[model samples]
Each structure stands twice: as structure tokens, then as C-alpha cells.
Target: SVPAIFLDRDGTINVDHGYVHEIDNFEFIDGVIDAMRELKKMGFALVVVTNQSGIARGKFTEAQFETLTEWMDWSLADRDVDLDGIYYCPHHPQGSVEEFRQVCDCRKPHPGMLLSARDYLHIDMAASYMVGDKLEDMQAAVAANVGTKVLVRTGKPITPEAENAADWVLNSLADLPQAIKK
Candidate 1:
């Protein structure tokens, strides 16, 4: 089975522009493309795992989200980085919109997406890693038994709780490639 790198979208990949739905607002984080290139060289399949509560909050439609994601994929493809998959959670228990106000296992803190990716990609969980900016990301990594859990200090500022939960903490996505190599 191939090893994989699970990445967070906002904060980790792009500078978190609040509820970013438009391609115009999607700014790539510094060194993010280079990082993906390095991971590709290491023979790791790249996948994006994100929580888009904005859909539930009525900030954006699912179609808009898909359009933005497609644009992102196309942009990354131009850099020669092929993303294996993109997973997002639209559920929000207290969402402003009724359609999205429900509990779902696909959300972070649950291993659903990671587990699903493992099955779909035929990945080795023990040889895989997860990089995200939230506590729930670490929790999902632990639950999924990923080899490494990296918390990037980007979108969500690091809190003591997040620091405690993470196996590794990075200043930014730029630091990730080096950390993974070691």
C-alpha cells in the first residue's frame, strides 16, 4: 500500500481568508507547492482534508465550494502536483442553515475521512501522516493510527490544548517538509 500525506486546506495550504469560497480569495501559503513537490518525491500520495462549516453556516453553497476546489486542483496540477483526493465536512450542529445542522462522522475528531481515504487509496496508515492546524485533526490522526501528526500554526492559532494533543508543532507549512524528512 502507498503511504500518504493528509493536508488541511485552510491555514495549512492557503492563508485562511475567512470563509474563502471565491478563487480570487484563495491565496497559496508560502512554500506550500514546494512542500507538496517534496512529498511527491518521497512517494507519498497527497490528499486534502478540510472542514467547510461555511457551507453549513450559509456562507457558501456546495457548488461554489466545488468550483473553488476544482480551481485549486487545477492550480496545483500546473505545479505538477496531483492531489489524490479532497475531503470536506459540511456538517455543523449549530449551523445557521437547517440542512447542515446535523451531526456527522465525517467531521474531524472522527476518523471517518482518514479511514475512507485509507480504503480508497489503499494507503498504509502506519506509514502515513496528517498535517493540520486544529486539535481535532490530531485527534483524527491518532484515531486513524497515522504515523505522524503535525499541527501547523496557521489558520487556528495554537492553543495549549492543541499543543498538548499534537505530536509535532510547526511554525508554518514551510517547516513541514523538513520535519517530515526527519
Candidate 2:
């Protein structure tokens, strides 16, 4: 079975400048393309798992998010790294919009997306790795039983709470490939 690399979108892949739903705001993190290419060469399937509460908070429409995502996909493809899949959760428990004010299984801290990815891709969880910028990402990795859980210090600075959840804390994505290989 193929080993997968589950990545978090905001803070991990792109600069976390609040809720990014527009193409103009979608900026790729430095060295992200190179990191992805390295993982691809190692035979790891690249997948994006994100929590987009902006849609639920009425900050942006789902169509806007999709447009930005499609643009991101194309950008990454241009760098010769095709994303295997992208999954997002558009739910928030305290959502400002009525349509989004419900708990969701697909949200981070939940294993819905990882579980689905495992089933769809037929990937082995024991050989897979998860890289996220938040505690929720590590929790999700743990819940999904992924092999390694890495927390990047991009968006939310490393905290005591995050320390317990992650297996490794990295200064940037540039250091991720080495951490995963070890």
C-alpha cells in the first residue's frame, strides 16, 4: 500500500493571514513546493486536509473557497507536484451563519477526513505521516493512527498544549522532509 503525507492547508502550506478564501490572498509558504517534491520522490501521496470555518462564519462563500483551492492546485501542479486529494470542513459549532452552525465529523480533531482518505486511497496508516500547525492536526493524526505527527511553527506558535499532541515540533516546513525521513 502507498504511504500518504497528510498536510494541513493554512499555516502549514500557505501563509496564515486570517481566513484566506480568495486567490489574491493565497500565498504558498516558502519552500513548500520543494518539500512536496521531495516527498513525492520518496513515493508519498500528497493530500491536503483543512478546516475552513470561514465559510461557516459567513466570511466567504464555498464557491470562493473552491476557486482559491483550484488555483492553489494548479499552482502546485505547475511546480510538478500534483496533489492527490483535498478535503475541507466547512462547519463551526459557533458559526455566525445558520446553515453552518452545527458540529461536523469532518472537522479537525476528528478523524473523518483521514479515515476517508485511508479508505479511498487504500493507504497504510502505519506508513503515513501528518503535518499540521495546530493541536487539532496532531489530535487528528493520533485519532487516525498516522505514523508521525509533526507540528510546524507557522501560524500558532508552539504552546504547551500543542507540545503534548505533536511528536515533533519544527521551525518551518523546510525541516519537515528530514524529520519525516527519520
Candidate 3:
């Protein structure tokens, strides 16, 4: 199986417009498309795992999220950057939406999404990489046994705990190629 690059959608890929569900609000970070292309060429399967608690918080509907996801995929494909898969955790234990309010394992800091993707995508978890802006993203990667955990600065403030926990701290996703090579 090939190694995968598990990415966090918000902050890591696009500008985080707090619970962004509309295309008008979704903006890709500068140089992210080219970075994805480079990562793809580096023989890593590109996959996205995001925590979308907005659904459970009643900020947006699942249908809207799905539609937005499609648009994101299309946007990337149009730029010759194809992602292998995208997974999201819509549940939040404290959410108002009872149906989606559950302590699910797919959330960040949990390994459910990465574990399932490992099996579904035939990925080598021990050889894979996880990149994100949040500390929970690194923790999830650790739980899933992903080899490298990268913390990129983009949308959120990088905490000292997160920066110290990451295997590599980068200014942006655009620096990943050189970081990985070194």
C-alpha cells in the first residue's frame, strides 16, 4: 500500500471562515494547489479529514456541506490536483442537533477517520504524513500512527503545545515539499 498525506481542510487547505459552508466564503490558501500537486508527485495519496461540527451546531445542513465538498473537489481537479478522498466528522457531543450530537470517534484528536481511510485507501499508516494547523490534528495522527506530523501556520494561531508537538513546523503548506525533502 502507498503512503497517504492526511490533510486538515480548514486552516490547512483553505482560509478558515469559521464554519465555511458557502463557495463565496471558501478561499484556497495561496500556493496550496501547487503544493498539493507537488505532494501528489511525491507519491503520496492526498486525503482530507476534517471536523465539521457546524452541522451538529445547526450552522449548516449536511446537504450544504456535501455540495461544498463537491465544489472543493472540482476546484482542485480543475487545478490538476486530485485528492484521493475527504472525510468529515459532523458530530459534537454538546451540539443542539441531537441526531448528530454524539461522542463519535471520527472527530479530531480521535483516529476513526484516519483508521478507516487506512483500510479503505489501502494506505500505509506507518509511512504516512499528517498535516494541519491545530494540535488536535497532530494528536489524531499520532493515534492513527501516521509517521510524520506537520503543523502549518495559515488560518489559526499556533499554540506552543502544538508547535512543540509537531515533527515539523512550517510557515505554510507551500513549504511542505522542501520540508519533506530535507
Candidate 4:
């Protein structure tokens, strides 16, 4: 019934420290708290789409990720920010964990996660958009037929491919809600 705002977890929402699954290593990006609150008032459901190859690489266990998520969800709720969905792909072609190792469609640069959100959350793909720090996020949004693709220059250097693929770019999450509103 409503549009969705798909967010990339690592770089977009939190500081990307390579493979970050441990709670101690997790840190929220600047302006994220207020921006999320504003987005909540704007009536958009937030969804997290992530590629967690660390699990597949056997760097951490699924339970470890889930434990962190539980804490994360609580932290958001404390700030009145509601996260509607969280989807992550644990598969990698060269993963050491046999069960999670494979070429999966659920990974970013693919639309599997977004499509699943459409089906599971009843979100309108035509009105939905995705925000991330990588071009892979834009590619997946394109495959999902999402409305817009925004690249935030918060994490790594903006690759030429990523900059070209994005419909909009922001210095931080603090700038996103207003840019989208007006």
C-alpha cells in the first residue's frame, strides 16, 4: 500500500569496517538518527538490504548477526525509528562455509532482496527507491524497477560507476529526507 525506502546497512546506515558483524564495531553514521525520524514522519517504510558475505566466509555465524540485529532494532525503536524489513544475503561464490557458499540471486547487484520485500511487505515497487554507498545498490534497484537510486558519500570514495548510476547524491543521511520531500 505504501512506498518503501530500501537502505544499505553497512555503509549507508552504519560505518563500514570491512566485515562488521560484531556490536562493538558497529557505529551509526552522523545525522542518521534525526534523518530516520524525519523519514518516519514522511510515511515511508524503511527496509535494509545487505550483502553479508562475512558469514559465508565463516568470519562469523548467522546467530552472531542476528544477535546484533536484535540490539540494532531495539536501538532504533528507542529513537522512534522503525525499520520495517531487513534482508541480507549470506552467500558468496568463494565462501568457505559450504552451506552458505553459492551464487545466489539474493545478493546485491541483484534484485532478489527487493523483490522479496515487494512480495512479503506488499510495498509498491513503482514508488520505492534505494539508498546506498555503492553502485551495486543502484544496479539492484534498477533490476527491481525501483523509482529512484540515491548514493550517499559517507563511506568509501564515490566510484565513477556509482556516481553515474545514482539519481541523487548526498553528503550524509541528514540531507536525504529534505531532498526527497522538496
Tens-place lDDT digits, model 1, residues 24-88: 89999889898898888889999898989999999999899999999999999999999999999
Please report the TM-score between candidate 2 and the true structure: 0.96
Worst 10 residues of 1 by lDDT: 172-181
Q: Over 4 Å off in model 2, which ranges?
A: none
Q: What is the TM-score of each candidate against the true structure?
A: 0.96, 0.96, 0.98, 0.97
C-alpha lDDT (0 to 100) for residue 20 of candidate 1: 94
Candidate 3: regions farther than 4 A off:
none
* Model 3 whole-model lDDT (C-alpha atoms): 0.93
For candidate 4, what is the TM-score?
A: 0.97
Show model 4 residue runs off by greater than 4 Å. none
Candidate 4 local lDDT, 106-148, one digit each (tens): 9989899999988999998888879999989999999999999
The predicted structure with the larger lDDT, 3 or 4, is: 3
On lDDT, the stronger of 2 and 4 is 4
Candidate 2 RMSD to the real structure: 1.1
* Candidate 3 per-residue lDDT over residues 1-182, each given as its tens digit: 98999999899899998999999999999988999999999999999999999999999999999999999999999988999989999999999998899999999999999998999999999889999999999999999999999999996899999988799888888889878888
Q: What ranking of all candidate models by lDDT puts the best one first?
A: 3, 4, 2, 1
